[model samples]
Target: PPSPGYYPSSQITSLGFDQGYTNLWGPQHQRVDQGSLTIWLDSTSGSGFKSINRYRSGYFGANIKLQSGYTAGVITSFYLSNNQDYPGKHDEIDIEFLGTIPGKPYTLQTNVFIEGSGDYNIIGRELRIHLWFDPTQDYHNYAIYWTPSEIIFFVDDVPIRRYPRKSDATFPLRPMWVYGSVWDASSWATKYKADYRYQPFVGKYEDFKLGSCTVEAASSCNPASVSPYGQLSQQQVAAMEWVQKNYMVYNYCDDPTRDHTLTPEC
Candidate 1:
């Protein structure tokens, strides 16, 4: 709703499903209409899809709709990862919506990993925020823009989080495939574990777009710009600041459970 005046409104051209992606798993639970893709999670299986090619840097995004009501333990995600190539260690940028109970809002978590090696935790840079609107009410645009210099997260073109390349060791440099998945993470909540009772939890996606430098990109390739200026403008910074001020729920930098030694930037 608060798109900064940068990059001609940053209106990404949508690439139809078959044009840019392929089903990665659970074909039975995934369906495609004229342009939309609907994926669901049932007791039988979950569904996922990935970009046709790996990208070095650019914008990856989708317009998504979520299942409403008692959606505990469900996870709807759009992310970039190179885990397929490096099973033990890989880079990733994530935009995940952790399902919620009836009265609560979804917790949208934006995370970054630079060669993480952890338990299921996979401790990385995480910033979780509660959305300003009910995510299940309708479709919303979510995206990640990557460049050699920075990474930014946007919702409906509103810049929500900006993760700059602070250091070589902290940023993810490897090429990665874009993916969208819906799964039942039963262990996420103790009592609210995925209730098959809700049956056929669904995630709808459309307007998929990929504007990036592929794996075969030239050494001289320059990432597509999100901002017209060399850096973020006051409009971009101000919008992101509003989100952080009102919606930020958790930030790794303030996590008491973490050892400050590992992340020295804070």
Candidate 2:
């Protein structure tokens, strides 16, 4: 996180498990204590949770720590989406920690979908990056700040990526609920299979920061600027630029094999 007051400080709610979310699946595989909620994927099943309410705009974020060692094909994720309500045509924003073999670093994949297919028929360009530090060593705040005109991704207050609304075709306007999950996406998350011997791949979460305009907010409800100021300061922009320069390892926009026709923004 770079700028201290880059994002809005108003109307933020620090909620506990029951206050912001509920078990969305595999209740048996999840647990919550005073400071954190732990969801795991074992032989029988994986687990997940979803926001108690949906929002049209605002900041949704959490402090998360991924499972340690030999994660392989396991995936730990936090995201915003309306997939449950509109399966065929969903609006999703993802922050997925893609597993890698032992000794290799994880890939942080950030993506956006607008009333179209998600992972199934994805748009060719997925922006992926590697963090400067080992994420599993400690918890880090990851967030998605969505407004009427832009969607910004944040890590520990550092602005990592900003997806501005170029046109209605590139943005999502529907309401979305925040979600977190730990699951096995072996075949699709690269070739390695999740080595179950390292059973109970866990995704730990805490510090729920939700500052949003709920579904009922009128179209005029403009809580877009999380900051008191309307947009990012130069320092914030430079910090984001630094991260991309040093840590970004993969980019759909730079991939030669990707079908550029599908990535209009590139």
Candidate 3:
């Protein structure tokens, strides 16, 4: 997105959403629609836009539904930057859940960006959860719990991705705002197939259900010492452990390598 493209609802000139044009969806929730996610101030704003509350060291999530076609740009989580090819300074962490057919479930995607003086290096990953076992028929819990050490991406209550925040710069080590909006993403969203197999997709947000967002600090929410997985509550830890043991497939990354122009297989 351009500089103006990433500004908060109050600063931008083009399309934007703040407290009036839309509903809060949930308390402190920003629903993504039309063409923008509610921009949060005080956090890691590239130019002058800042969303400080985004930087949290605990669990946060939403309940969203799929729009029509899985169109790129229709997002319900974070308004992330994708100018990796010709980057300046950008870093982000997002929980992107793709929309599928009514009978189908949702495919979740995750990415990490590092702000540095170089090409925008990012890591993209995904998980398939049966979020559509019922459809936008109702709202379900979708969230990510990040500690200094670990990151657990979940839907409803099932843990999908247990990402350990490696000290490597490639992985982001900051809190992100739970922002959502539709933007141009024709380039890389995966889609669903007739066989129900998931390819890169894109779509709109139905709704956002945000539950207990513990504002209090973690035992010690140090980005470096805590494990996103380690930061999970003890009950969630056990659930994650079970998911890892039973459904773990040793993969090179998230999905099998796709022969794309941008990032081909190594």
Candidate 4:
């Protein structure tokens, strides 16, 4: 387990529309007000946002409210990626909301890829789980803490998943930029495959806490000196276990059909 720490609201900074970078299709559908950022999807296209600077290792979090109704093919995502510069060799930490059929629980999927190992390599390190609450009804905090030794995923400040780096080959050691997007992923996002029927889905974001050490190199970032930023408590470990035992739907390490040679950690 990682060390335990709490992030207060005072250390957070609000981000404006121009403070970061957005894709060609993002600006028209993005809105920021009172520290809240909202992006919507329609019949034509969806929206996305990305940070201007990259951080080597640190804590990043935000409050997210996913779209409701027949959102079978929609995906609301907030994650870290180094793909802008690395292209096919990108490293990414994903927190994707995989939409489901109406009334069915949404899937909160977390994944990590080092040096683009999962891109067509079919060796994805994915863990798909369902939340305990109605994600569409209200906003919930989702966070990722990445250090040189490990990466931790949090839900409403509760530790849910922890991935330790056994070796540099299995870890994401490069700098990554923070990003959020709402898009139509009709192919694999829903329980029943998407057929382009669902549309006009919206994703709400608020209280974005980008409380991390921004740096150009990984060695300059020191997580231990930062109080309560990289550690997880025993209670958090118990919570993580409960979520995994009850809500986890898929884990690449547990998949018998997957090629274990590609993922040395498994």
Taken over the whole model, the C-alpha lDDT of each candidate is 0.84, 0.82, 0.42, 0.78
State the lDDT of candidate 3 residue by residue for 1-266, as single tens digits: 01111111122123233321343233233334553443221122111122224454545444444443433233334332323422555555566544444544454556444554334433344433433245335445555556556665765555656767555554555434544543333344445322212322222332332222233546444432112343445555565556556544432254556322333322
Candidate 4's residue-wise lDDT over 1-266, tens digit each?
A: 23234533335664554555454356788887765788988877789988777887777778899887887777899999998889989899999998888868999999998888565657688999988899999999888888888898888766678899988888999889899898878655426655455666889988777666677545555542223443565656776788788889999899998888888887
Which consecutive 10 residues in model 3 have the weakest lDDT in total? 1-10
For candidate 4, give the lDDT: 0.78
* Stronger candidate by lDDT (2 vs 4): 2
Find the candidate with the highest TM-score and give its number: 1
Ranking by TM-score: 1, 2, 4, 3
Task: Please write out the lDDT profile of model 2 over residues 1-266, one tens digit for every residue.
Answer: 34544644334656788888999999999999984799999889999999989998988888889888888888899999998899968889999999878789998989887776646555733678899778999988888899878888888777788888877877889899989999988878543888889999999998888778899977667654555467877777887898788888888778788776655766
By lDDT, who's the top model here? 1
Cα displacement (Å) at residue 153, model 2? 0.5
Candidates 1 and 4, the one with greater lDDT: 1
- Candidate 2 Cα lDDT to native: 0.82
lDDT of 2 at 242: 85
- Stretches of candidate 3 exceeding 4 Å from the true structure: 1-56, 68-74, 78-88, 101-105, 116-123, 128-132, 189-266
Pairs clashing within candidate 1: none
lDDT measured at residue 96 in model 1 versus the true structure, 0 to 100: 89
Q: Judge candidate 1 at residue 181 and give its lDDT.
A: 92
Candidate 3, lDDT over the whole model: 0.42
